[PDB]
Symmetry: D2
Subunit: 502 residues, 4 copies
Amino acid sequence: VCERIPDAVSPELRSRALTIVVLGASGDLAKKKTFPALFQLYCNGMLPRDVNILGYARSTMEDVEKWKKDTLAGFFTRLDERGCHVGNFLRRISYMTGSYDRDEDFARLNERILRMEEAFQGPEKGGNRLFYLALPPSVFVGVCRGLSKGAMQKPELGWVRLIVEKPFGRDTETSEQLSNQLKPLFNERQVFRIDHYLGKEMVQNIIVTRFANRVFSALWNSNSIACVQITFKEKIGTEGRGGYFDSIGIIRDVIQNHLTQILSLLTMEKPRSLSAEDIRDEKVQVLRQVVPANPAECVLGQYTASADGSTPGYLDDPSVPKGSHCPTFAVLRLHVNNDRWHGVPFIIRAGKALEERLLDIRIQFKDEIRPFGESTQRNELVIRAQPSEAMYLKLTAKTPGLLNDTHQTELDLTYERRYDVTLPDAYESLIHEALLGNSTNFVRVDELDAAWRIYTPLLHAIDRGEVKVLPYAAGSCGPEEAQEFIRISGYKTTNGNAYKCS
Amino acid sequence: VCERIPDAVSPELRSRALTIVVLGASGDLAKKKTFPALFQLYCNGMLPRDVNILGYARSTMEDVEKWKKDTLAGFFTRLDERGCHVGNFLRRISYMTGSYDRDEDFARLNERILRMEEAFQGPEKGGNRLFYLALPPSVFVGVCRGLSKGAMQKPELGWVRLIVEKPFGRDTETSEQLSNQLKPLFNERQVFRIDHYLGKEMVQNIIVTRFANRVFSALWNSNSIACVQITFKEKIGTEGRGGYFDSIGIIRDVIQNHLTQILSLLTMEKPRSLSAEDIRDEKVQVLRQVVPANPAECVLGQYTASADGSTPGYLDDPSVPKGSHCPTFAVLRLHVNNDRWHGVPFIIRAGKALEERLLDIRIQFKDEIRPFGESTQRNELVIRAQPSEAMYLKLTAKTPGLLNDTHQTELDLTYERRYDVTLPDAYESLIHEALLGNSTNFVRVDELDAAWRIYTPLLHAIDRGEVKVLPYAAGSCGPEEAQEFIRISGYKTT
Amino acid sequence: VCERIPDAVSPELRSRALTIVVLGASGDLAKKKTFPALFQLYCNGMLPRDVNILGYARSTMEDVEKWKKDTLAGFFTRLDERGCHVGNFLRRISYMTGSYDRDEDFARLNERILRMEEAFQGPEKGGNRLFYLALPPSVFVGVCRGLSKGAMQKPELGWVRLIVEKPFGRDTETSEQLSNQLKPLFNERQVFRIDHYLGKEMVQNIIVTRFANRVFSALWNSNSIACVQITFKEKIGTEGRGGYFDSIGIIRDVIQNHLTQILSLLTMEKPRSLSAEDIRDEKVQVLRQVVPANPAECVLGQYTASADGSTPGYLDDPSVPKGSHCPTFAVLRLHVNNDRWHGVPFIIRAGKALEERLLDIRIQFKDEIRPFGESTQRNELVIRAQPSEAMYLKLTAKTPGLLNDTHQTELDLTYERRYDVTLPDAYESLIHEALLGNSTNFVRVDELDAAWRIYTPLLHAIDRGEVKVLPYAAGSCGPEEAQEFIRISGYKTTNGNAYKCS
Amino acid sequence: VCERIPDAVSPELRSRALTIVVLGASGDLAKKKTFPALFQLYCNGMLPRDVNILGYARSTMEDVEKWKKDTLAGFFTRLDERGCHVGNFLRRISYMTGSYDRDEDFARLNERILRMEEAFQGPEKGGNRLFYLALPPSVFVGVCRGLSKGAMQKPELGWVRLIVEKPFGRDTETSEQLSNQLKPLFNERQVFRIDHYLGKEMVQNIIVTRFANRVFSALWNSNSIACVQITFKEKIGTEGRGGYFDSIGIIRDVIQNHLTQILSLLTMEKPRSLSAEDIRDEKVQVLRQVVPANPAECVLGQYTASADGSTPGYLDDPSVPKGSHCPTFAVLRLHVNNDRWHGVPFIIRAGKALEERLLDIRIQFKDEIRPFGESTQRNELVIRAQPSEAMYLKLTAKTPGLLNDTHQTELDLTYERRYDVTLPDAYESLIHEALLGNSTNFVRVDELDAAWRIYTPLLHAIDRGEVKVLPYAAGSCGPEEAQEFIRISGYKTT
Ligand SMILES: O=P(O)(O)OC[C@H]1O[C@@H](O)[C@H](O)[C@@H](O)[C@@H]1O
Ligand SMILES: O=P(O)(O)OC[C@H]1O[C@@H](O)[C@H](O)[C@@H](O)[C@@H]1O
Ligand SMILES: [Cl-]
Ligand SMILES: [Cl-]
Ligand SMILES: [Cl-]
Ligand SMILES: [Cl-]
Ligand SMILES: [Cl-]
Ligand SMILES: [Cl-]
Ligand SMILES: [Cl-]
Ligand SMILES: [Cl-]
Ligand SMILES: [Cl-]
Ligand SMILES: [Cl-]
Ligand SMILES: [Cl-]
Ligand SMILES: [Cl-]
Ligand SMILES: [Cl-]
Ligand SMILES: [Cl-]
Ligand SMILES: [Cl-]
Ligand SMILES: [Cl-]
Ligand SMILES: [Cl-]
Ligand SMILES: [Cl-]
Ligand SMILES: [Cl-]
Ligand SMILES: [Cl-]
Ligand SMILES: [Cl-]
Ligand SMILES: [Cl-]
Ligand SMILES: [Cl-]
């Protein structure tokens, strides 16, 4: 039962050759997310039938075909809808052992690209290159310098694009210098600094729901909005890779990158055009007006063992350094300093080993005092990006029936209920958009700095030991102090119920 | 299934006696809507156990109990849950034959009433009297004068309330006269001028959805709203009851009353309080600012026989006068002259023998020009009061999937899907509210005036033969000219 | 150059007789404000030439004509245009000695009015009666009961109207009692509770400037207005009449009556019609939404002796009780609890023995953050009701000349510069409006209650000794704590007005 | 009086030499506006003491010094304060006779320029070169190609800037060609396209008054503004030189440039920053949304002799081609297609030989219907850029006195009454801003395009003879049809 592959290959891609180099092909991200996404884009018939996926990792691969069919293929998802195509697809993937420091190996990479670029039977004799750098931050600049030297495409004979994965430094100084390190190496246009939250279905609709509809457009200002809440929740802890996380922390890992992006699209002014840079310009413009996070206006947590004992404590990890104070949870109150968001509190929440898995945006409107008084409560527009993709506006309506009373209700749109479409993984969209050359869903340098500049002073205060990191039971709602702070920060509504929650 | 009726009748009605007189009990409205609604209020245990429903009509009855069990009872609805209660309920209804002009017959209705509240075993002496006047407009003032003479309750011994059914005159001059005819007879507080749309579940939420929510409150003005459309659609025509209709017409029958009612609620400013008098004050205030309908800003229709022939032509009715020009369909463009509704077009639609049964309100917001251009289209808040009571906001969203495209969608709330509750008939709410003394869902005299003053000049122009009445096939969408006029009036197809 | 008397007398006042009884005619208010205003209305040709002004006081005066020509007439103002008319006018005023408690003295009042109405050369045989009660609060109910008994006009022969003066109780309980005391005596329609601020030129334009202009109408809400300041300033102290003031205080004397009035017209929603009760209904409606003044949100003062010795201390008055803590100055922060004024601070200021004489309203708009930043500052619409009647909108504009800099400026309208008209005294308008039957510029009972209910809890706290009364030099800007509180309350702009002020 | 000139010349202009070449020094513009503005900037001590103004022209002078003190100097204005400085100033101006096409004369210009900066006694080597091209459009590209070849400052030895005067083509195609003709010759940064309207005191405050004030910011949208009127009025006609105007017309001469400029500033969204390009980006962005002027939505005029006869007819000029139909007057209704200006009419007026001299902007707000009705009328914010520099907001207030009546009033600010400062001529600011390198008050190439694209279809229709050109008496208000059109266009004559 497998759906056929139509020709959705964009006309640009089906004239010149194609080579998708996955640098760090053995690595966890590439096995789990990159290669699987490439399979789905192939199945969609969005990649040319004669595409060349080249795996460039350090691993001394004995049987490539076994790793391809057993390891790699084990991660492909729709198989009751596209299982037969696994064979034809895998035939396009080739592996190549090599180092991220020896120029002889990058030359050996240029060598292999051309040997498989020359084999193209199409109209243009050039060849296009997309390099996915899913490699450690420890070797990043090496590979960038190596690829820019001897792995580039001849002029008027194709494009070179680079998908740069995170981390992007620990702070603004760290990131700034890395951004300087790439300036000679590549033109910004070639760089595609990937944030995957810009590939999530609900995250993409932020710009449409906000600038296609007069209903939301007229309400998106300080006069109508009383509070804005961005929430990240994860049932899982670090559990295995706690050693890795210790050096990053909840703010650097999710808040600085993923949720500041949510924040940029939520707060930005209407773009001049729907152009990539026109959209990107407004994103940076608004983060340039975000006041840097102050330590007194935040709550930090670190998870301890669950009541059941099934989830262990954060520190109860051998990889986690003894006596660590790394925050696994954070709640922040941010302020956008412009005539649109003046006064409006921005409550950003993020935590691991919590009560539920959740990604949602909450635009809480002003309370309508008269004529309903206590019979009513703040309306809020809720956009849940995961688990069930949905958008719902919470209102106050008359209790249906033979009675003169009120009740809170929803004007819901549940994606799983209303659409028979099997929505793509964030990475399918991004990789595809990068092949097309759409720099919109990719972090711009200035946009990235604008983001680092918000958290760097807070991050430093935290690292200097100035900010207290409260303990909370794994699987609970989080520290008590946080829910109180959220109330003080300006958020209301009695819709926060678990056994723990209130 | 059959379960015990609870004694949840409001404590006001608990102390003294109760008598609900249905004048014109033989009549079509009473047997189809009044009596059935009274059964449901009894089953809810909202009426006292010992309530007295008295039928009073010109009709002579051989077997009242047969008419009660066969005619009357045949109209009761929930019978898979409430079927057993039909017996106990019917036991409360009594009938009496009488003229609507002979004072003796009135002295006879009162005597029955005296004796009923004389049999009460409760805390207070005397009784409460609610009179439902579901009788022709031809005998109305006769009964009002008669009841006010010898059928009233002595002071400090109970209340008398009058549920006055429509029609309320043929125009503003006719209605004025009638209201003056009732001024000495009864105090306005006693009068309960009934418009049944005010009892519809979705029509009631108009005030809450507008003034409890900041989302709709901030948008309810000329700056955000591009057009407002009130739609009445009926699959059925005049049928046998066409002679009666000829003298009334679609404007007088539905637009003037029911739809101007929705219009008042939709346009009114936030009430000072949620008080009866505070809510109604704003209703009149806004109809006082509605510009009277001009003949050039309207389209009229009259149905022809259907393609199948199953629905005969309007004119093909023996009761319908030869060569009549009575409109069975009307579309109007109204203008509210205040700084909230300045410019905003108000498209009111109403017609019989159309393509579907429909009652909906459409609040069409301004088109958001840039950056989406043609990739987007006017948002609309849609409140459908019937068939399926639902509220949905139409919106533009990204085509779900691996696409950079748009699609129109909505944010639904379908009352049938979301609530397990068997919603009441408009008349259950109204009759109940009238027993409690809630004058909110009842037309006020100035409110009635304010309404008549909108349509009277248009109605007269029509009756003078100044306005053309276009023909349309029964069961069709209506005349072509109407859809074109709606486009010109400011409404955008979607 | 004596401006002749035109027949601009309203048609109602023509047909039936007219009798204006001034109860307490010897009293300070009557001789200083009432009688002078009646002269000006006579001169304007607004009162019938055959009008009857009857002075009913306790004083046992010998030469009435001397008191008329020397005392009374000495207070008349325009005499370089209207000086000749003093004679003809004074001929209409007559005096009567009599108690405020003996009914025989009231019957004797009825008796004289009857003789006057019996001398009327006009169409109707009855006569109209306007009673100006400018008498102590100590005898008020006595006169009301006496007039209602035997001083009323026969049915279908003329109207009776009562101009009632301040004070209207000590608090809400005191006022309630008094209003109930008058309920059987007179119909509210007959009662004309006088507040003279509704008689001031700028105070009257509050309703026009707000509901005739789209410019101000669109801005009169929480989204555009950042703060509202009502200011009362008086260069003079209690001087001799410190005894009279000790029992009243600055809140009861000006904040409760005069400035809550200014406040009602500033905050009210657009009236249904321009009708008297349609206007009055919105006034009552908005004061019903004012949250009662809390003691922690206020500053109180009591004037000390001035540096120059010219103004002695408040307590340095023989009439002022020893060790009295009566506030001569008050600043409070009020909150209107409705969707229009939600969040908007209302700073009400009032004080005697201050730096300047001033009555002004300040509608301070939100600060426009970008693109001008510190180069700009909050715009504020200023309506000054006295000294110079003016209305001016403060705005930021480019420094005129060969410069790229900013400067604050005003779009002024000065009534003495622009209009070259001799504006009437507050009391001319009011007395005239009362003869016509315009209850608009008169306090309604619910409008009086709604006002008392704001200050009664604060007033009580003050009288219980719970609120601190700070000392301040006579002729200074007031206590230091007050200016700081105003800043904290939400009021801005760098007004370095005096040596003291900043 | 006569006091010392201070050395307040900007520190950038201090280090390196300065040469201001006025190409077309004989010309009417230079002798009347350029040279006089140069004198005032010198008197201000805004130009270095050792500045070099070089007049380059085809004309020949026997006595340059006579033309300098008698012709040139006769046009200098403040002489009761600055009259003594005429000498010292004139001592900086030098002249040269040269063709605007022969390369020898361009080598000969450069020759002078190097030698002048060779004589500089300051810190930096080389010198800065500002070229004011006040020459016919007939020789423009010839001088641009000639200057770009020869008289160019060597790199790292100073800047070269070009103040290019109008006209900028006669349509979008004409202008496009010309802009492409300059693309290789100079970088846009060097080009300074002058529209002197941008130097007028009130035109400059357009950006401050609408983005520094919350009062005007909150009102600057379709919800509050009912109509916007831009007016240019001139008491004088074409006079002696008309044939020259015949090829241009009122739309190309004033509207397309000057008034579309005001229009851009009035309609633009709040700039990202106060940067030169941040400001210029919003200007182009809004003209990119202006719908092109349609012929049916405009009125054209051509002045006829005055009743007095003092002003002769437009055609009664020998230079004016026989049977011409050139518009000397135009009134247009423009539409900005964005969610800020949706529906708002933009009435642009412009005419020569009219009743008065006038430049004003009129922002007419919506009429406030209730509770005042006819007792009130539309508020209007009026900015008058000439004759008397003033800004006044028109509003309704209670008739002062013993009255319950209304009257129209204004919250004036008259710059002549409020400030004792002798405001500079548009050209002083511009020339100064160009020496500093502030590209804000200068037309951008895309700005120029965006402007041309509005009027080019209308202009062509006019030139094809498709649009009627009505006659009007010189010195009158203009054609009757125009005032009627303005009323229909949405302007409610307050
Ligand atoms: O919307 P509803 O419940 O069908 O009510 C509309 C009814 O309105 C009444 O006025 C008419 O007599 C009916 O013919 C019509 O059907
Ligand atoms: O400077 P003013 O008086 O406002 O006039 C602007 C003038 O500017 C000139 O550049 C135009 O050629 C004229 O047509 C126009 O009249
Ligand atoms: Cl900043
Ligand atoms: Cl629900
Ligand atoms: Cl759904
Ligand atoms: Cl730091
Ligand atoms: Cl018609
Ligand atoms: Cl319309
Ligand atoms: Cl149904
Ligand atoms: Cl639903
Ligand atoms: Cl039904
Ligand atoms: Cl008529
Ligand atoms: Cl309340
Ligand atoms: Cl004064
Ligand atoms: Cl000033
Ligand atoms: Cl001034
Ligand atoms: Cl002035
Ligand atoms: Cl108390
Ligand atoms: Cl904006
Ligand atoms: Cl477009
Ligand atoms: Cl001038
Ligand atoms: Cl001039
Ligand atoms: Cl002025
Ligand atoms: Cl003037
Ligand atoms: Cl064309």
